């Protein structure tokens, strides 16, 4: 119908005038329609098939589908990329369909193939990495969690190793632990460390008023990136800031540094081995820097790892929390599914504001100014200082 | 964002104008359009995130939820829901809060919850019992389907006894011979059995035409449902045309014809068990119908169901195939997944017009018409005759 491809064609309009927020706004928008018109018959085909995504994702990129496929500069049969990947021709050309169906791949007019947006981000080795972790690492702890919950009778889930993950993969240990005794999961967490979160804080943080009159001299440290994983934050502060002076340094565990090297500065920023479980060895930084790290951890654990940092700090000091910060209602699905998700493998939570400052005051620390760089979904640069 | 309150009003109002095929063409373009807005990494939490509602979906079900807040007259507390349920009262909140976000519940300003459009659905026995088959019996599969492919370097699946079920469920049975064989998934199945798809191939089966001088004496079958389940076709069929001669005959095995006892009118319906892998014991029928029936087996074991039915056949009798009858190419999400899905449990397909007449044609059958009655995911009654 003509309607049809009018309301395609005003949608992708009004996508184009608005920036990305604004594009996040209407997808969710699309999404909320959709559920809002759907039948009963269609929610339940919905829940039932959507399913179905991950699983053929996974295949395609065990097959190496979604790279040969966004190289291809013409239009590829199903039987030419299934001698080609060495697929059976008839199982290809049935996960082609249902690719094209979910625009994981595009299909032609003469029924060929062609790359989407999705085969070329699934062709991206980072965002491979996480389509991955869903199939390997989240999908077993979800299968595992209503049986689980039945099991314990509804219990609020507080601790990392007594949660649905030592039901999914049969183990005393937390995720964190068990993850280091599994080299396939190991690899493609190395891998999927790689990928950069864009937008990030430097795009509303207001360094220069947050610096205030703090001096680097005589040899004091701007920014310490604590769990800095590649260090994306400390090559993006030096990249937004080359001028402000102050020690820049990644902190994390040596296997971690160690993959960091390749693609760290040559000069300008310190890789330093530390365990966030330890003292914090760097005396009064400017910012110490916490970037997803304690929505991984229940609260008696994200409270010991700032207490860890809280002796280091001068009065000038600051804890940065970089995290997620849902609102106290209208949650989008993207931070209440990462909150189902890290309660059912970590034991942990997503926080609102309020209890993000209930636990930095039991560290003893005060919310001086929060920045949000994403909109819908809350993330934000949240500035602690000592009480 | 206005514009966002915008969009809905607009996609609101031309949804209630159109009829349920434009809604559900609306919906497919909704869908569309989310894909191609996506940001790569949005492409990653949909499919990282998106599986936890049928986890999600099954925790509520086994709490009651659903059917609890669908009685409710008035806006219920996490609280109050959680002492109501017998759930931890951070565990509920943090569910509801995750349902609210994918409107599984909806939540009021006051953070309070009641029942939406999917509270309602996930109420209903019938589709409560599609969203635990797709939690049991789907996911398990699929969750094999990939490392399945892989060890067995991609073959083209096409049978019963060798497809991802056996390794998802550690056996060497087919789907069906193990389902009967488990209790539980046995009593989910009949409760599945009493949703009745809307429309149904009457909405535009021409019965009359189709019929032409047909007569019922001696005591002959006007209408054979071979499989029916419920028997939903057969009361529809009497329900549509009371005055119409011919015996109307459900056939399906013992149980389930018990099950469909209580809800079958107490005249004009006979209740005959019979095993459709068994030589078809009516003779001369006018309609022999099969309506989803042939789609869960391969086609060697879907050709030996028709001819055991071919030998009873007349020149006037007809085998009405009612079934997916998905394009040769554009083909829907809900008519591919459900393909992807058959393949793993089943071995078995979504077969093209072309594939059907292919099929029928090894069974001594021609295609006489062909009669849809659902769009755009085709569902279509196909009229066979003797070749
Ligand atoms: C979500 S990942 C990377 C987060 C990183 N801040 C970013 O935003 O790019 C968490 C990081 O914590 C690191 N990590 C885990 N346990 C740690 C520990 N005990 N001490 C220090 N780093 C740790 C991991 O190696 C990983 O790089
Ligand atoms: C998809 S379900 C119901 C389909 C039904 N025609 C309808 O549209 O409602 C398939 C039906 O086949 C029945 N069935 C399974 N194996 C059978 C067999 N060997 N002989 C007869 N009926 C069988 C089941 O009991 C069930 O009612």
Same mark, same amino acid.
């Given at each position: 119908?003509?309607?049809?491809?009018?309301?395609?064609?005003?949608?992708?309009?009004?996508?184009?005038?608005?920036?990305?927020?604004?594009?996040?706004?209407?997808?969710?928008?699309?999404?909320?329609? #959709?559920?809002?018109?759907?039948?009963?018959?269609?929610?339940?085909?919905?829940?039932?098939?959507?399913?179905?995504?991950?699983?053929?994702?996974?295949?395609?990129?065990?097959?190496?589908?979604?790279?040969? +496929?966004?190289?291809?500069?013409?239009?590829?049969?199903?039987?030419?990329?299934?001698?080609? +990947?060495?697929?059976?021709?008839? +199982?290809?050309?049935?996960?082609?369909?249902?690719? @094209? $169906?979910?625009?994981?791949?595009?299909?032609?007019?003469?029924?060929?193939?062609?790359?989407?947006?999705?085969?070329?981000?699934?062709?991206?080795?980072?965002?491979?990495?996480?389509?991955?972790?869903?199939?390997?690492?989240?999908?077993?702890?979800?299968?595992?969690?209503?049986? *689980?919950?039945?099991?314990?009778?509804?219990?609020?889930?507080?601790? !990392?190793?007594?949660?649905?993950?030592?039901?999914? *993969?049969?183990?005393?240990?937390?995720?964190?632990?068990?993850?280091?005794?599994?080299?396939?999961?190991?690899?493609?967490?190395?891998?999927?460390?790689?990928?950069?979160?864009?937008?990030?804080?430097? $795009?509303? *943080?207001?360094?220069?008023?947050?610096?205030? $009159?703090?001096?680097?001299?005589?040899?004091?440290?701007? *920014?310490?990136?604590?769990?800095?994983?590649?260090?994306?934050?400390?090559?993006?502060?030096?990249?937004?800031?080359?001028?402000?002076?102050?020690?820049?340094? +990644?902190?994390?565990?040596?296997?971690?540094?160690? @993959?960091? #090297? !390749?693609?760290?500065?040559?000069?300008?920023?310190?890789?330093?081995?530390?365990?966030?479980?330890?003292?914090?060895?760097?005396?009064?930084?400017?910012?110490?820097?916490?970037?997803?790290?304690?929505?991984?951890?229940?609260?008696?654990?994200?409270?010991?790892?700032?207490?860890?940092?809280?002796?280091?700090?001068?009065?000038?000091?600051?804890?940065?929390?970089?995290?997620?910060?849902?609102?106290?209602?209208?949650?989008?699905?993207?931070?209440?599914?990462?909150?189902?998700?890290?309660?059912?493998?970590?034991?942990?939570?997503?926080?609102?504001?309020?209890?993000?400052?209930?636990?930095?005051?039991?560290?003893?620390? #005060?919310?001086?100014?929060?920045? #949000?760089?994403?909109?819908?979904?809350?993330?934000?640069?949240?500035?602690?200082?000592?009480?």
């Amino acid at each position: 119908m003509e309607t049809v491809a009018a309301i395609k064609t005003l949608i992708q309009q009004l996508a184009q005038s608005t920036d990305q927020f604004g594009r996040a706004e209407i997808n969710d928008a699309l999404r909320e329609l #959709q559920y809002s018109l759907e039948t009963p018959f269609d929610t339940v085909m919905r829940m039932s098939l959507d399913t179905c995504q991950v699983a053929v994702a996974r295949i395609g990129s065990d097959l190496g589908l979604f790279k040969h +496929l966004s190289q291809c500069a013409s239009p590829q049969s199903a039987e030419e990329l299934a001698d080609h +990947l060495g697929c059976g021709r008839e +199982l290809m050309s049935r996960l082609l369909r249902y690719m @094209a $169906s979910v625009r994981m791949v595009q299909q032609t007019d003469d029924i060929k193939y062609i790359s989407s947006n999705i085969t070329q981000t699934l062709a991206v080795p980072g965002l491979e990495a996480g389509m991955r972790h869903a199939f390997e690492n989240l999908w077993p702890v979800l299968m595992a969690l209503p049986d *689980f919950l039945a099991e314990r009778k509804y219990p609020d889930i507080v601790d !990392a190793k007594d949660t649905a993950f030592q039901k999914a *993969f049969n183990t005393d240990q937390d995720c964190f632990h068990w993850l280091a005794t599994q080299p396939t999961r190991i690899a493609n967490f190395k891998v999927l460390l790689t990928d950069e979160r864009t937008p990030n804080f430097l $795009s509303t *943080f207001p360094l220069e008023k947050e610096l205030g $009159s703090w001096s680097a001299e005589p040899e004091k440290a701007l *920014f310490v990136d604590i769990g800095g994983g590649m260090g994306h934050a400390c090559i993006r502060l030096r990249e937004k800031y080359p001028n402000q002076p102050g020690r820049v340094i +990644l902190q994390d565990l040596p296997p971690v540094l160690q @993959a960091a #090297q !390749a693609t760290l500065p040559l000069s300008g920023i310190e890789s330093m081995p530390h365990n966030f479980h330890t003292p914090q060895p760097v005396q009064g930084a400017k910012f110490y820097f916490l970037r997803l790290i304690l929505r991984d951890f229940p609260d008696h654990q994200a409270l010991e790892i700032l207490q860890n940092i809280v002796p280091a700090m001068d009065a000038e000091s600051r804890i940065v929390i970089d995290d997620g910060v849902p609102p106290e209602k209208g949650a989008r699905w993207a931070e209440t599914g990462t909150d189902i998700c890290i309660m059912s493998a970590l034991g942990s939570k997503e926080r609102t504001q309020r209890q993000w400052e209930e636990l930095a005051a039991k560290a003893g620390l #005060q919310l001086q100014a929060l920045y #949000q760089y994403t909109w819908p979904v809350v993330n934000a640069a949240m500035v602690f200082s000592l009480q």
